[PDB]
Design an enzyme around this catalytic site. Structure first.
Site, short mmCIF file in Angstrom:
data_model
loop_
_atom_site.label_atom_id
_atom_site.label_comp_id
_atom_site.label_asym_id
_atom_site.label_seq_id
_atom_site.Cartn_x
_atom_site.Cartn_y
_atom_site.Cartn_z
N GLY A 286 0.81 -1.21 0.00
CA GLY A 286 0.00 0.00 0.00
C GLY A 286 0.84 1.26 0.00
CB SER A 287 0.21 4.57 1.48
OG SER A 287 -1.01 4.73 0.77
CB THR A 288 4.69 1.28 3.23
OG1 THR A 288 4.42 0.09 2.46
CG2 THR A 288 3.80 1.26 4.50
CB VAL A 289 5.54 1.72 -2.38
CG1 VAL A 289 5.41 0.25 -2.07
CG2 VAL A 289 4.23 2.23 -2.96
#
Ligand code: JXJ
Ligand code: JXJ
Lengths: 395, 399
Positions: B135-138
């Site tokens: 998810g948004s951790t990238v």
């Protein structure tokens, strides 16, 4: 707006989160702290016993006597000894001998109060205040104190310890010793020695002493399920009954009751009420037994943790310890309660600790084998954490 | 007869006693250490991986773990999983300078001193066997890539108005007509990162994520260690290219994500992970320009400041550079379901990172599921505990 439960230094042990209770130490302190409804009503533990105060009816927080550091290291050793020994359960209670404060009260198995819905009911109930077991050999220091007080023996008396019978009932020791010193009686945990000691005093003798040390008395923490044991109120005591009483038969104690016995030993005869709330000292308590006499038996108890005594596996490098191991058949079956109770440091006791391991099934069950190592591990950690300076002189 | 396993400072974690194996931290380090059978042979975790070493002399083995850090990590994680009624959680703490795993914990756990009939699914090490979409951790890697290619500068303002491409809606949690590049991370703007991705070739982000180790083996030698699911597609649709920029279309283990953030923490130096104590200098290899990573780490500080999605991870006295995440789980029929992974990943202290931490909470069911609501407080409590335990000088400057 519920009161926050903290340890004695303010470390949060139960706190309302925006609203839901959260328990930061989780299963480490679960039995003592308890938990609440969806109505945030307390229904177990301190959450229940102090619910009116928690609600603010009486800032309305609650600082327990618990030191979370000590609670955590107690639980760690206790819980893993219960697992490693395939035991039904274990309980450990640590008491400040100067104040009567419960510094730690742990049980295994525990559960996570942050999500307890699935936990087995019997796992939820505290065992240190509800379980009652026969105390076994942990009473022998009180036997020796009694016999000395009544002058029936002297500090260095040598007792004949060959086995014998009362009306066909064989009185025997784990190992056969012709004679033993008074110290040796405790060091080898000689049923013979204590039984002969009891048989030269009225039946009331030990009944008085045990009560003076709090056996058969309420612990008065106000926790739900708290239990007072069974204590003998027999008008007339049989010879077999009189003898088996000198080594823990015929009465039943909670781990908490035993911890209080050893806190009264630790203070050299000052009986102090237990507290789960932080106490501002001094606490006077009651002088239930002469200081010189208790002082003497504490020194005799050091031999239990020295080579030759049955609790040598509880030894802690650098510190004198005065302990007593016990082993009790459960009710009779080939299942056992493994005990080690003691105070430290023996030169000037600060802490009383009891370790009770219930039904060890890993091939070993003797107190000195099962719970004495745990006593040493815990009490060693307590002494370090509390910056107690070593006790043992180099030799 | 069998060597002792210790933490990095010699504290016993697996010891043979007269004999039987005893584990002094019990369930706290269960998944990593593992256990032995009756004949004292290792069958899980380090006990198996190092079985030949541990049993010619029987050698002791010093893990990279610091038991003090392991314990506080497990404490926060385990109570958070319980409190959130979550299926499970994983937390991995990595030394930014050495690659050493300082803590690796999962909940639920079991007691290795009596693993009687604990479910097989409780005993596996989820930090290395669970794969979830990141998810948004990238997103920090998206910004890094966009900066390197010059399609945006450090102060570019992006139109983040909601738009639909090829029938698929691209939308943020909150709507914002425009955002700085820092805002894109601070608000975790799917819209903003999707526009950065669409202005670059599909290979751009594939390459960056791989350089930070996604899709690559973690190489600890642990039984069941997994590498995830990583795209090998030649051809990418426009929608795939966009969703890849907010972490759709690949699946990582918590351990892999921790290595990403360790690589962020070192300002672009990629280091192999280690569960054994390393002799300190570990040079690693530079995979991305230091100045560019440094720039995005500062941007990431906004995530833990008022206005940022991870403000609940804030630690008094310390700057932190984090990214929250919330990912729909893929259900057993291969489609998304109404269950979530709650993420918080980050490094501290942000002035000179020493630690990479990831917190992964799987299927929280107590009314909250967003990473910022579920994992962020856990990240904060753990990392604050880490910084104090390791005596890190506060970096926060009074204002
Ligand atoms: C002291 O605790 C004393 N214990 C006993 O006599 C009892 N049981 O011992 C037996 C065993 O096999 O363990 C049954 C022989 C006992 C007292 S009350 C009760 N319910 N069970 C001995 C065994 C002399 N020492 O125990 S020790 O730990 O000090 O070694
Ligand atoms: C970043 O993680 C971003 N998350 C997503 O776009 C994903 N799901 O978002 C939904 C949700 O659960 O709220 C489904 C709408 C996603 C990416 S990959 C995957 N399997 N699922 C946002 C929405 C920004 N996460 O919020 S955040 O503040 O935690 O970053």
């Amino acid at each position: 707006s519920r009161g926050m439960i903290t340890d004695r230094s303010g470390r949060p042990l139960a706190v309302s989160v925006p609203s839901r209770r959260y328990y930061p130490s989780g299963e480490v302190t679960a039995h003592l702290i308890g938990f609440t409804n969806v109505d945030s009503q307390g229904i177990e533990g301190v959450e229940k016993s102090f619910d009116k105060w928690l609600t603010g009816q009486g800032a309305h927080n609650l600082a327990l006597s618990i030191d979370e550091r000590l609670q955590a290291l107690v639980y760690r050793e206790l819980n893993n000894a219960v697992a490693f020994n395939k035991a039904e359960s274990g309980s450990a209670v640590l008491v400040d001998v100067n104040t009567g404060e419960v510094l730690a009260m742990a049980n295994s198995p525990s559960y996570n109060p942050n999500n307890f819905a699935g936990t087995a009911k019997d796992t939820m109930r505290n065992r240190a205040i509800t379980d009652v077991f026969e105390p076994g050999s942990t009473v022998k220091p009180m036997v020796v104190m009694t016999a000395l007080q009544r002058g029936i023996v002297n500090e260095n008396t040598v007792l004949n310890t060959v086995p014998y019978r009362i009306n066909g009932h064989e009185i025997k020791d784990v190992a056969r010793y012709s004679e033993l010193t008074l110290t040796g009686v405790l060091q080898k945990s000689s049923n013979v020695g204590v039984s002969k000691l009891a048989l030269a005093m009225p039946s009331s003798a030990l009944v008085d002493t045990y009560s003076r040390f709090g056996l058969g008395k309420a612990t008065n923490l106000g926790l739900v399920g708290e239990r007072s044991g069974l204590y003998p109120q027999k008008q007339r005591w049989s010879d077999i009954e009189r003898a088996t009483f000198s080594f823990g038969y015929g009465l039943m104690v909670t781990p908490l009751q035993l911890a209080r016995v050893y806190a009264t030993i630790g203070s050299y005869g000052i009986y102090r009420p237990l507290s789960i709330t932080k106490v501002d000292p001094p606490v006077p308590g009651e002088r239930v037994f002469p200081e010189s006499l208790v002082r003497t038996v504490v020194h005799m108890m050091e031999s239990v943790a020295l080579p030759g005594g049955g609790g040598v596996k509880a030894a802690i490098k650098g510190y004198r310890i005065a302990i007593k191991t016990g082993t009790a058949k459960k009710v009779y079956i080939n299942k056992y309660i493994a005990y080690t109770a003691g105070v430290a440091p023996a030169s000037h006791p600060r802490f009383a600790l009891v370790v009770v391991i219930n039904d060890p099934q890993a091939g070993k069950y003797y107190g000195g084998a099962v719970s004495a190592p745990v006593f040493g591990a815990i009490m060693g950690g307590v002494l370090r954490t509390m910056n107690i300076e070593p006790d043992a002189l180099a030799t």
